[PDB]
């Protein structure tokens, strides 16, 4: 995952916070060092091959410093609630074919011009109610979408029982309608899924979607049979696949830019981000100006990531160690 | 709508005068086995150096618009769906994007293009991987942008970067992209037979139902039924790998059985639909949305390959569609469903019959139809359809969507001779081995309409 | 004195080409690893059996 | 010899003797 | 019984 | 492979039917209909209503008869 | 078995086993002779222990 | 189960009367051994007289 830079950006994983240079013993330790005059801030840390210090931040030449929680960096998956249009008919009219076109927009390619469509179809019956429609619609959608031998999963299908109204009933291709026994179904939730991820090589990306409806002949009138509204999101993609890509890039500004290229003839870098753990990010953005005529700024930033467990314990202690050393006023998340 | 039994196939273990004819008789009350050869030879071949896995280049597209994460007002509080208008009186506000894609002093537009243009007032302040811009409106927009037009998932494109004519400073930037790549594998097939020209223990007899109810060439059966092992591996094969790269099945030697996907699994990863009733309403909508987004108007010819009973089902669905075209009166003068044939029995003697083989949809989408005979295989296809056939003839397959400047589907091969043969005299076992592979470069250029009774 | 040697290869190594990420070496009789340029694996097996 | 409707011939596999 | 002649030395590892 | 069984059934929603099997017991004659019949992919639709063995010595007799009428549809 | 990687042979009329392999067996009978060991003197360090 | 299947075959798909058909016989790339077999068919006769 290549990112943009204002100028060079360095990341330091804060796996443990110490109070001296001498206490740095394990890979992932950190200590914010400063003066007693508070004119220079740097971060001594323990690399996987020894102690390494960061750049020296002039505390007069800081632009901003802000700390971002984990839930700010968690992607909310988009949900769409597919119902029958009550103006058209609240019950399925008999003998009509109910086809639904899910329009994917950023399928495999990177643009909106690379598009993809998955269909679901139900021909309504004489005694088919609304819940028996949503049952057969979601069985037909999951049969087309969530086959096992697809290339990537696209969306998740969930019925909702009107008695429950807050618990998602998962519908897959292996699901039969013998398993779906509830008689009060009021919507079909279609919700996007998390794509695969390889660190550095495949970034975190999502394929957005919209459900679209073909018209039915209701009373001699070609009316589109349903409406699709976007309900509030109830799931989040965690921060871990985003920070490990943020470390894989920012370990070439310190380390090797040739990552893997002539394969046995490489330096291999040890990365201290566990991709299955959430992190909080602190961005100290600062600059350098020269003596007399070298007044152009070299605006750069030093990133710090700390793993946090619910309440942000390790980041608020990191900020509290920076604020007493630097004299800064970084706000605590 | 019902069958009657005309034959029964029994094994031999469940059991000279003059000859009228010397050569044997194949009755029409017997199914006969179908080659997958004409289907497989309909595809080209491409030879490789070795059995190593191979890769190639996949080149994509460039024009992105960026979804919104959230919007904030000037004090940092986020914008909600039920909130008031944001940016009333060109007061600034914040616009959080998951990437840094726009530059300083650029006009960006949301979902409603050019009604609310947003001018970026400075560089992106980082928040993790997010990028927060301070923006304001750029159209004389006094009343602000509504809170519905500032929610998550709203796409944002770039427009330009306008400056002042006097004493301006630098704005804008340029953007770069990269391609991807994909892989494919091989698979290995082996046969044996313990044998000379005479049969062995796997024998089966065919008894017909009529009213009052040689020597085997073993070198022609080990070549035909191993050519069919390679035909079934090519077209009807399945992969056994994890997403960890691990193969799941191990052979007799403890080494993993490496298998690669076939024709019908690789082309069933995109554009595949499972229907419970066939319609032109589903077919012309599936083929138009793919052609509206991928194909020019002249390049929209769709040759449906299907079975023989798929041709009579497509005929009756166009005929039902034509019978609802009550605007136009169809006559025998143009269509000639009743023509004049020459007969001894009458001076004016008629004939009757027709079949719809083509359907032409609006905006240039033309749907043709031809029949492959291998869909009607009684051996492989065993679930039956209530209208006659074996329910796989009702499968429609659009191969060759568009023109590619190269083949999309081909048969992989190793240069030289990758087929092996061996005789193990004790016991006299004939051993054959062959490695093969099939590659589908772009599976999105292949659409399948399978009946949903063949699924799950 | 009667002596014997044995080496076993799989049948997959009949024409196995070596994509040399590092160079493939031969063990000499002197003891020196000499760099070699033949890309077939059975050229190196037949060197070490002899 | 495979028939035009892809059907294989079973009489080729025999020897008359 | 792939006996290397010499005088008489008999090899025994399977059929050759 | 012992006896003959003539079945009257009813494909649910589609119509009525007639069939004949050869099986040792009527539990297998329903097995040879649901698995080898025309409704092979939707074999839950078969509702067998009557099975009776084909015994000979009448030598001339009806075994099954089932009309789909205009008011059943 | 079915192919010989050593001699580069694909296809086998007379098979050894059914496995995909090839095993090479090499054998030699050899000796040395010293006729007069009183025409030869040795002088060994005793930490080699004879 | 062979096709990457990690959830199993349903119990509905393993009942009496379901027909089964041979596709092919796959092996390893390394150290393979014999698999598969060949099937035959036999003719019956019809009769007439004078
Ligand atoms: Mg496809
Ligand atoms: Mg001596």
mmCIF file of C-alpha atoms in Angstrom, chain F residues 1 3 37 62:
data_model
loop_
_atom_site.group_PDB
_atom_site.id
_atom_site.type_symbol
_atom_site.label_atom_id
_atom_site.label_comp_id
_atom_site.label_asym_id
_atom_site.label_seq_id
_atom_site.Cartn_x
_atom_site.Cartn_y
_atom_site.Cartn_z
ATOM 1 C CA UNK F 1 -35.580 -57.725 -9.419
ATOM 2 C CA UNK F 3 -41.933 -58.010 -8.662
ATOM 3 C CA UNK F 37 -37.726 -40.212 -12.871
ATOM 4 C CA UNK F 62 -56.680 -51.776 -15.428
#
